[PDB]
Amino acid sequence: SAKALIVYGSTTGNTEYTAETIARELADAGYEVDSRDAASVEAGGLFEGFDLVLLGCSTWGDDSIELQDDFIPLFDSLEETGAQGRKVACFGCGDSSWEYFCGAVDAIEEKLKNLGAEIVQDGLRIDGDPRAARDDIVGWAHDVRGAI
Ligand SMILES: Cc1cc2nc3c(=O)[nH]c(=O)nc-3n(C[C@H](O)[C@H](O)[C@H](O)COP(=O)(O)O)c2cc1C
């Protein structure tokens, strides 16, 4: 039950760093972790064979909530990923200057629920430089593991 997939959409590297930090935590605990940039993936069957899936995505939009561009195709085809009955958790970087702080995380969680996923922990929301939140990131990964 030890295969974890992490897929991240990141433009300035913050959610990517967050993904790398989570990946190390899971690997140290005994998971086999496959980490992929969303730009490199196709949605159809993306979750097949994974016991745990973690989705990371930063939040954008001039005057609306928009997902990071590389993640949008995955979100638009999320119903083809194999999410039904899948244990999933979400994370993302943002900036609390914006009212909808890490709003991409909400959008992804809400769709995953409709699609039959089991959300194993509330999404991780990181404000500003994620290296300043390293302890929170590692703690969230630990908490995700404990809720499996
Ligand atoms: C036009 C623009 C819109 C943004 N909108 C939001 C937002 O609605 N909510 C939020 O939390 N952060 C928002 N951000 C902040 C980014 O998500 C933040 O820079 C984040 O660190 C980027 O993470 P990444 O490097 O993983 O892509 C916005 C940034 C820009 C430039």
Author numbering: 1 to 148
Please give sentences taken from the publication describing this entry:
Previous studies showed that proper introduction of disulfide bonds could stabilize the flexible region of target proteins and reduce the conformational entropy by locking the protein into single desired conformation. We applied our method on two proteins which were previously determined to high resolution and frequently used as fusion partners for GPCR crystallization, cytochrome b562 (BRIL) and Flavodoxin, and verified our prediction by solving the crystal structures of the wild type (WT) proteins and mutants.
Eventually, four pairs of BRIL mutants and three pairs of Flavodoxin mutants, together with their WT proteins, were crystallized and structure determined. The WT and disulfide engineered Flavodoxin structures were determined to high-resolution of 1.20–1.55 Å with B-factors in the range of 16.15–19.24 Å2. Based on our algorithm, the best-engineered constructs of BRIL and Flavodoxin show lower entropy and higher diffraction quality than the wild type proteins, and the predicted disulfide bond on GLP-1R facilitated crystallization of the GLP-1R transmembrane domain.
